[PDB]
Amino acid sequence: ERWWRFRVDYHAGPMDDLILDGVRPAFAAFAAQAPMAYFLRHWRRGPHLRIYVSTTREALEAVVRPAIEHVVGGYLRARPSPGMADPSAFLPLHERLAELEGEDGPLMPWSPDNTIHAEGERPEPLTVRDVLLADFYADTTPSVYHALERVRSGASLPTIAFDLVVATAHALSTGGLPVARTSLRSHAEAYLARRSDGVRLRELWRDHYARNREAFTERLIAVASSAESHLPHVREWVRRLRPIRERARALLESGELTLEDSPAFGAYRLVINCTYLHLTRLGLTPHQRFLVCHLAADAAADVYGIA
């Protein structure tokens, strides 16, 4: 009936693993009794995972709170985080992140490493955007798993970032990639604009695109061919995302959300930003996100600029 929250600290250890070899099996255990659950990386009081599960109180105490305490808590004992030498070194970054993200909690002392912590239920009344979001995560948790397996299997993470954010653009937009590429470039540009060495960075990203042009131009052609049917995750992600698009279109045709025209470039804008929120879930840093969008747009230029 409610959303229950857990905090897993895992400061200096690979989160990719905690997810595939701890949280995924914990979730898989109470899937019968509580199939609605999702997890999110966060930074406050130490790098960590926050788990959010939708069940009744005593279903929590009987099958969910043990699965987590035991499966996940097991992993923690198997492969502990070494810890972070100085938590205070991150303090001025985090104090900034606090005010910047609106994060209201204490920042020091750090919460104990390799530890689970029940954090009760989430505030009480939720907005309607909060709960389309919650649904998006849950609905996509398989694709989180699908992708983190291949990353650990040797595959470049930014390349999945690429294909996803490209294919989202060619599929779930009003007019395909020849139109939606603007939004890609717009995304990178909002970043670059705020960097002091924005210009030397644009030169780096343009030099890099130049050297490896045939590479990006081939792969864009492929991600686009396959977003509209020889690649797996693409039409997995595409088919997985269409229902949130047209649900979102309905949920603005009625009008409950653009506090932060709208059935077109308003639905798609929601789908694409979830495709970004997903990338954060896969561990991709902001800098590589922007870097990947910039490469797409440039790539988009050489292929769809000639029409």
Partner: peptide, 9 residues
């Protein structure tokens, strides 16, 4: 094949 993302190549 995977795309190179090494920009100080």
């Amino acid at each position: 094949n995977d795309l190179p993302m090494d920009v100080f190549e």
